[PDB]
């Protein structure tokens, strides 16, 4: 049994907005849990964030996690923006709510309990687990069954 929770995530979208989905693989306890769902109308950025949310939300106690994803948007958010957005109450410079604040806040809450180590992989050089996420995300977007409630053409 691994001594660290391993998480792999990916998200895909056919349009902007368009049908999209995510794939997440989680290695927790002695199991391998796979999560995937497609949404009728959403975006690539929101699916990549949803991948990470559902995997962390599965975590029932404070863990030491290693998250692997080739998503620029999650990376950008986590390394450059998230800190600053909390200091500014989740608003832009022109004082509006940040884009996808709904998901970034959800993600923020989900990271809180954990000791997380981020692994940013390049698309063409991920582990066998990242490729399966991609494949899952792509298949989910082809048969979408959920509604992305928080999506807005708007804010």
Swiss-Prot record:
<dbReference type="GO" id="GO:0004523">
    <property type="term" value="F:RNA-DNA hybrid ribonuclease activity"/>
</dbReference>
<dbReference type="InterPro" id="IPR012337">
    <property type="entry name" value="RNaseH-like_sf"/>
</dbReference>
<dbReference type="InterPro" id="IPR022892">
    <property type="entry name" value="RNaseHI"/>
</dbReference>
<keyword id="KW-0540">Nuclease</keyword>
<dbReference type="InterPro" id="IPR050092">
    <property type="entry name" value="RNase_H"/>
</dbReference>
<comment type="subunit">
    <text>Monomer.</text>
</comment>
<dbReference type="GO" id="GO:0043137">
    <property type="term" value="P:DNA replication, removal of RNA primer"/>
</dbReference>
<keyword id="KW-0963">Cytoplasm</keyword>
<keyword id="KW-0255">Endonuclease</keyword>
<feature type="binding site">
    <location>
        <position position="70"/>
    </location>
    <ligand>
        <name>Mg(2+) 1</name>
    </ligand>
</feature>
<protein>
    <recommendedName>
        <fullName>Ribonuclease HI</fullName>
        <ecNumber>3.1.26.4</ecNumber>
    </recommendedName>
</protein>
<dbReference type="GO" id="GO:0004519">
    <property type="term" value="F:endonuclease activity"/>
</dbReference>
<dbReference type="GO" id="GO:0005737">
    <property type="term" value="C:cytoplasm"/>
</dbReference>
<dbReference type="GO" id="GO:0000287">
    <property type="term" value="F:magnesium ion binding"/>
</dbReference>
<keyword id="KW-0479">Metal-binding</keyword>
<feature type="domain" description="RNase H type-1">
    <location>
        <begin position="1"/>
        <end position="142"/>
    </location>
</feature>
<feature type="binding site">
    <location>
        <position position="134"/>
    </location>
    <ligand>
        <name>Mg(2+) 2</name>
    </ligand>
</feature>
<comment type="similarity">
    <text>Belongs to the RNase H family.</text>
</comment>
<dbReference type="InterPro" id="IPR036397">
    <property type="entry name" value="RNaseH_sf"/>
</dbReference>
<comment type="function">
    <text>Endonuclease that specifically degrades the RNA of RNA-DNA hybrids. RNase H participates in DNA replication; it helps to specify the origin of genomic replication by suppressing initiation at origins other than the oriC locus; along with the 5'-3' exonuclease of pol1, it removes RNA primers from the Okazaki fragments of lagging strand synthesis; and it defines the origin of replication for ColE1-type plasmids by specific cleavage of an RNA preprimer. Involved in production of retron derived msDNA (a branched RNA linked by a 2',5'-phosphodiester bond to a single-stranded DNA).</text>
</comment>
<feature type="binding site">
    <location>
        <position position="10"/>
    </location>
    <ligand>
        <name>Mg(2+) 2</name>
    </ligand>
</feature>
<dbReference type="InterPro" id="IPR002156">
    <property type="entry name" value="RNaseH_domain"/>
</dbReference>
<dbReference type="Pfam" id="PF00075">
    <property type="entry name" value="RNase_H"/>
</dbReference>
<dbReference type="GO" id="GO:0003676">
    <property type="term" value="F:nucleic acid binding"/>
</dbReference>
<feature type="binding site">
    <location>
        <position position="48"/>
    </location>
    <ligand>
        <name>Mg(2+) 1</name>
    </ligand>
</feature>
<keyword id="KW-0460">Magnesium</keyword>
<feature type="binding site">
    <location>
        <position position="10"/>
    </location>
    <ligand>
        <name>Mg(2+) 1</name>
    </ligand>
</feature>
<keyword id="KW-0378">Hydrolase</keyword>
């Amino acid at each position: 049994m691994l001594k660290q929770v391993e998480i792999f995530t990916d998200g895909s979208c056919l349009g902007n907005p368009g049908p999209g989905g995510y794939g997440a693989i989680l290695r927790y306890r002695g199991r391998e849990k796979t999560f995937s769902a497609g949404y009728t109308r959403t975006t690539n950025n929101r699916m990549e964030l949803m991948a990470a949310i559902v995997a962390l939300e599965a975590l029932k106690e404070p863990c030491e996690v290693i998250l692997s994803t080739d998503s620029q948007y999650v990376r950008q958010g986590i390394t450059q923006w998230i800190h600053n957005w909390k200091k500014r109450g989740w608003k832009t410079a022109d004082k509006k709510p940040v884009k996808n604040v709904d998901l970034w806040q959800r993600l923020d809450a989900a990271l809180g309990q954990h000791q997380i180590k981020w692994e940013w992989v390049k698309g063409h050089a991920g582990h066998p687990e990242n490729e399966r996420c991609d494949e899952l995300a792509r298949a989910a977007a082809m048969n979408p069954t959920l509604e992305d409630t928080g999506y807005q053409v708007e804010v």
